[PDB]
Amino acid sequence: DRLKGKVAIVTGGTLGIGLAIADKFVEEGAKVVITGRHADVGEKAAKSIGGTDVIRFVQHDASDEAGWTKLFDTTEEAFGPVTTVVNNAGIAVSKSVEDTTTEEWRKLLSVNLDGVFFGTRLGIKRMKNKGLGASIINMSSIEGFVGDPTLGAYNASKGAVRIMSKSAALDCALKDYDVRVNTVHPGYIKTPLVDDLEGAEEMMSQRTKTPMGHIGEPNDIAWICVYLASDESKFATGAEFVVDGGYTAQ
Amino acid sequence: DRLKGKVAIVTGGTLGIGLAIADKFVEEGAKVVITGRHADVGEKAAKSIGGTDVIRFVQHDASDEAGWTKLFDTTEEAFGPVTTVVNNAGIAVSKSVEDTTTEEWRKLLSVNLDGVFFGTRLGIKRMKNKGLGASIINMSSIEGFVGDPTLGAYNASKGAVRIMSKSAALDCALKDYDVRVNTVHPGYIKTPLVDDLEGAEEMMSQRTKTPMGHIGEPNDIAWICVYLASDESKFATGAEFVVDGGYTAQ
Amino acid sequence: DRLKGKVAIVTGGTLGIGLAIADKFVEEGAKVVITGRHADVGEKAAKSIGGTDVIRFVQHDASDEAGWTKLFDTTEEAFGPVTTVVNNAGIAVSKSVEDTTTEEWRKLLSVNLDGVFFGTRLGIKRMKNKGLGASIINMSSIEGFVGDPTLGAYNASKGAVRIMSKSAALDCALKDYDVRVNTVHPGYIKTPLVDDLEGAEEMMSQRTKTPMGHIGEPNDIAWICVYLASDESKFATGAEFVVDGGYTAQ
Amino acid sequence: DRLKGKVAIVTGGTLGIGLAIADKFVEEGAKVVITGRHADVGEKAAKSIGGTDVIRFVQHDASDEAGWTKLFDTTEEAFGPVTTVVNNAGIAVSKSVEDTTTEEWRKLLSVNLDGVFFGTRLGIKRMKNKGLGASIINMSSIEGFVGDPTLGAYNASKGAVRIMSKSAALDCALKDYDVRVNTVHPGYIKTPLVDDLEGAEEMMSQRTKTPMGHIGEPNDIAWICVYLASDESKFATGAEFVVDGGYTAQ
Ligand SMILES: [Cl-]
Ligand SMILES: [Cl-]
Ligand SMILES: [Cl-]
Ligand SMILES: [Cl-]
Ligand SMILES: [Cl-]
Ligand SMILES: [Cl-]
Ligand SMILES: [Cl-]
Ligand SMILES: [Cl-]
Ligand SMILES: [Mg+2]
Ligand SMILES: [Mg+2]
Ligand SMILES: [Mg+2]
Ligand SMILES: [Mg+2]
Ligand SMILES: [Mg+2]
Ligand SMILES: [Mg+2]
């Protein structure tokens, strides 16, 4: 089991990429707490993967600062000390910078930027200096590397996550905290939410977008996250792991 | 005059890099409004460069959304339509991600990220489709490219500015708005604020930090900004201009 | 077994990083041919990993164009169609650009650049359109991202490998060849050759070089290569995978 | 005059981008030697810009190592010590990595990579430690950042130039040589050679290629080169200057 003994929090773990991360983490021997905003969805998601000896759902909005210390406490009471934090919760807004309202701006940043900050900051405090082989995996995207004219606030959030993560990685390395911090950058990934938007997959699959001529699937992101959570990646910190069908290569 | 007919807003234009940008912009024929939080400083700064037919100071905090439309109005009443926005206002916090308080986080992002967003969004709206050769110059830094363990929130802000600017550049290009958007990335620059911190310049000048073995001066940033404001750079958009003594090259 | 059915060529597979790649590839079910310039070393290396039903050594200099088609033939006769090419053979010269002789320049490029070109070009021709889940892993380094004043020709070679690999990745993706191409970028890795150079490991382990305060080991590179050779990484192409202890993050 | 007292060699200076660089360098007060392979073209090119007190043509192939020291001698005899080297000579091949012949590979690298190496190495030796404010400007391209499936060898060459230049920049900075080294990265630029290829400009101008919806002109590259040759850019070294209509921003 590649994640033997690991205890992971996966935010936004009830859907899509986060759900697949949680699934493969359990498959590789980790104990997992998945979070999400909606109880019915989250309860169903946890049970689809396993029983409560390996996976539990906690209702939590990643933008909710006070709930973060309670999420660590709940996870530790269930499974023992947290070793792995996957800051995956996020939302998107389909607006250019020009057309973004301040309400849209602040709401998106509250989840995509503050949530990652809260999970990274608290993960460092709670995991440092414990010999855990701890790993913080911050979900950026291709929109952390390149602009999209229709994703202005999303681009801001993903660029922030990209570079903030390097700061955290360096501090943890320099202080011998035994915590690594890295970013994962999905390209387009097929999910029910993509399926719900008529024409989206076909636009994303055009060769001028994704050179492979199709989009990915959630397990494509789960497998790079297994590598980064595992001790196999003990010399990887401060780096960016791109799984995008070639999007950023052209 | 390389900036003949240009009308520029330079935020944080009363000190340091912003002051030098304003100085060289006036030297090259632009009319300039500089902003800053402190009236005595700003009044002295404007008069040090020129008379009110070429430069004026407006007291404005870049984090103040409502003041942005009034700043454009004041500038346009003085000098005619704005052509050039330099989003240079910014603050720094000397904290790791781990040690950043939420108050510090939100305050720094309010200036460094929201201020750039407000100036970029409003610059697009106010300058598009007017044949102005309009240019938005967003001040990132080397901390938009690489982490610094002691500058966590600053790194987040500068990474956000870096990638958000690409979104804006693309939208403006695709829609034929006649607005370019680019980022400038200073390395270490000697200013009175650096001089006020005992030992700072020497730390910044170590070869493991700045390969040139010294730090820069404000005019180093002013001259790349002249290029980007001028029609000489009419094919440059969505790009990052690094002036750092080699910092990021190693 | 994560590499079930895979058949790999690992150039420079008799020492260091390449040897560890070959070792872990065999552990995960691949059949492997390792190459190197020296027969005694290579024979010992292959036997240290396994018997000839899983690993063989072929004497080959990666700069030797004519030997490439014979290497594929030998590998295919042993194990069936090649699925995976790891272009790892390389040499280093300790010279600035200024101090590099033309002889040094051409010799280093003959292995580090031509060898990767030959293996990539021939891997595409020999592996395309066969439903193999084929993967070409080109060994760049941190010196593909950042300069080192003492490694001028090496930097040229590693930058070339970095961007050439993106071209190949795109062509293969656009043409539905079922071949992925990615680069791996080691930081400093402890090997007998590092051990042979008094003071080298300590210089490499300074925090201003490697933030983790130590260097890596060959298996750190082997594990990212397992991921990239495996079908787990079927949506990853044209990307750069950095395993460097934080070197490039600052 | 922004280049007062400068003495420049511009390789491939008889056509296109190089010709415009030479033109604007003369306009800004530099003395210039342009090189090219064809005497009739080069003689006409030099005379189109000015008389022999400001510009001369020397027939030289940048791949010709022995001719480099004679080119510096000829330039110095005419105009005094060389201060500025623009390594702009280059050729292109329209082949994927897969389809590149070894002859094509070696020929393209002989100009695009060896020529830049020869000019950079010799520029350092001939310009260091003379208080010249010396500047080496190495012409990369967007193909130094991103792959193009049809430009495999070109991508290799441009990636090599990109990273080799950082090595040289660092060495020069660390040794206080008073030599800066930077790369310029044109996107698509309208030239007679583009005009000669039916359909090329329209393909290059598609929004999925160049977001601005048109290609650039040679003076777009000349103006960034003026900045980099001038003392205005005295703190810029080891950096990449992209003038591409947004190509790399998406
Ligand atoms: Cl979903
Ligand atoms: Cl706590
Ligand atoms: Cl100041
Ligand atoms: Cl308004
Ligand atoms: Cl070794
Ligand atoms: Cl063959
Ligand atoms: Cl031409
Ligand atoms: Cl000489
Ligand atoms: Mg609209
Ligand atoms: Mg792109
Ligand atoms: Mg502390
Ligand atoms: Mg660095
Ligand atoms: Mg020497
Ligand atoms: Mg063909």
DSSP of C44-70: HHHHHH--TTTEEEEE--TT-HHHHHH
Residues 6 or more apart whose Cβ sits within 8 Å of residue C195: C201
**Radius of gyration of the CA atoms of chain B, in A:** 17
CA distance B54 to D28: 26
Tell me what percent of chain C is helix, strand and coil, each rounded to the nearest 5.
Answer: 45, 15, 35
Strand order in the sheet with C31-36: C55-59, C31-36, C7-10, C84-87, C134-139, C179-186, C240-243
CA distance D248 to B238: 8
Count of alpha carbons within 13 Å of A79, Cβ hemisphere only? 27
Residues 6 or more apart whose Cβ sits within 8 Å of residue D173: B211, B212, B213, B245, B246, D180, D237, D238
The answer to whether residue A148 neighbours chain D at the CB level (below 8 Å) is yes
Contact list, D242 vs chain B (CB under 8 Å) = 236, 239-240
Find out whether A38 is annotated in a ligand binding site.
yes
For B119, the domain range is 1-250
Tokens for A56?
């539990």
CA distance B245 to B247: 6
Q: Are strands D84-87 and A31-36 parallel, antiparallel or unpaired?
A: unpaired
Closest Cα in chain A to D208? A208
Tokens for D26?
């003369």
Q: Which one, of D179, D164, B213, D178, lies nearest residue C148 by Cα?
A: D164
Residues 6 or more apart whose Cβ sits within 8 Å of residue D84: D3, D6, D7, D8, D9, D25, D30, D134, D135, D136, D137, D229
Q: After which residues is chain D broken (C to N over 2.5 A)?
A: none
**Best residue of B126, B164, B183 to probe chain A, by most A CBs closer than 10 Å:** B164
Resolution in A: 1.2
Identify the three-state secondary structure at position C136. Answer: strand
Closest approach of chain B CAs to the CA of C246, in angstroms? 10
CA distance B235 to D54: 28
CA distance C116 to C157: 10
Burial tier of B174 (Cβ tally within 10 Å: 0-12, 13-18, 19+):
middle
Residues 6 or more apart whose Cβ sits within 8 Å of residue C198: none
DSSP 8-state code for residue C111: I
CA distance D138 to D179: 13
Identify the three-state secondary structure at position B130. Answer: coil
CB C11 within 8 A of CB C62: yes
CB C193 within 8 A of CB C16: yes
B15 alpha carbon, closest ligand: 3
CA distance D110 to D115: 6
Burial tier of A182 (Cβ tally within 10 Å: 0-12, 13-18, 19+):
buried
Q: Which one, of C163, C177, C245, C175, lies nearest residue C210 by Cα?
A: C245
* Helix C115-127 with C152-174: angle, nearest 10 deg: 10
Tokens for B192?
């009175």
Burial D9-43 (b: 16+ CB within 10 A, else e): bbbbbbbbbbbbbbbbbbbbebbbbbbbbeeeebe
φ, ψ of residue A34 in degrees (nearest 5): -100, 140
Find out whether A62 is annotated in a ligand binding site.
yes
Find out whether B206 is annotated in a ligand binding site.
no
CA distance D32 to D46: 9
CA distance C42 to C47: 9
Tokens for B173?
């290009």
Number of Cβ within 10 Å of residue D196's Cβ equals 8
Q: Are the beta carbons of B249 and C148 separated by less than 8 Å?
A: no
For chain A, the farthest-separated pair of C-alpha atoms sits apart, in whole angstroms, at 49
CA distance B36 to B60: 6
Angle made by CA atoms B91, B96, B98, in degrees to the nearest 5: 125
CA distance A120 to D53: 63
Question: Residues D91, D92, D93, D95: is their CA dihedral positive or negative?
Answer: positive
Identify the three-state secondary structure at position B152. Answer: helix
| CA distance to C115, C208, C215, C219, per residue, from C186 (Å) | 18, 17, 10, 11
CA distance C149 to C134: 36
For D27-71, the three-class secondary structure string (H helix, E strand, C coil) is: HCCCEEEEEECCHHHHHHHHHHHCCCCCEEEEECCCCCHHHHHHH
Q: Are the beta carbons of B148 and C208 separated by less than 8 Å?
A: no
Closest approach of chain A CAs to the CA of D141, in angstroms? 13
Q: After which residues is chain C broken (C to N over 2.5 A)?
A: none
Q: Are strands B31-36 and B55-59 parallel, antiparallel or unpaired?
A: parallel
Helices (H), A110-215: 115-127, 152-174, 192-195, 200-205
**Best residue of D163, D174, D185, D208 to probe chain C, by most C CBs closer than 10 Å:** D163
Q: Which one, of B189, B186, B179, B192, lies nearest residue B158 by Cα?
A: B186
Burial C165-177 (b: 16+ CB within 10 A, else e): bbbbbbbbbbbeb
Tokens 């020999």 sit on residue = C126
Q: Are the beta carbons of C117 and D150 separated by less than 8 Å?
A: no
CB C87 within 8 A of CB D156: no
Experimental method: X-ray
CB D88 within 8 A of CB D18: yes
Q: Which chains touch B (3 or more CB pairs under 8 A)?
A: A, C, D
φ, ψ of residue A189 in degrees (nearest 5): -130, 125
Question: Residues D216, D220, D222, D224: is their CA dihedral positive or negative?
Answer: negative
DSSP 8-state code for residue C114: I
Number of Cβ within 10 Å of residue D102's Cβ equals 12
Find out whether B15 is annotated in a ligand binding site.
yes
Number of Cβ within 10 Å of residue B120's Cβ equals 28
CA distance A235 to C188: 10
CA distance C127 to C82: 7
| CA distance to B83, B178, B180, D229, per residue, from B125 (Å) | 12, 11, 13, 36
Catalytic residues of B: 154
Q: After which residues is chain A broken (C to N over 2.5 A)?
A: none
CA distance D55 to D58: 10
Contact list, C238 vs chain A (CB under 8 Å) = 211, 244, 246, 248-250
The answer to whether residue A236 neighbours chain C at the CB level (below 8 Å) is yes
Q: Across the strands, what pairs with A215?
A: none
CA distance C136 to C133: 10
Catalytic residues of A: 154
**Best residue of B101, B136, B163 to probe chain A, by most A CBs closer than 10 Å:** B163
Q: Across the strands, what pairs with C180?
A: C135
Find out whether A185 is annotated in a ligand binding site.
no
Residues 6 or more apart whose Cβ sits within 8 Å of residue B49: B19, B22, B23, B26, B32, B55
- Counting the structural domains of chain C, the total is 1
Of C147, C208, C249, the CB nearest to B147: C249
| CA distance to A150, C190, C191, C215, per residue, from C195 (Å) | 52, 7, 6, 12
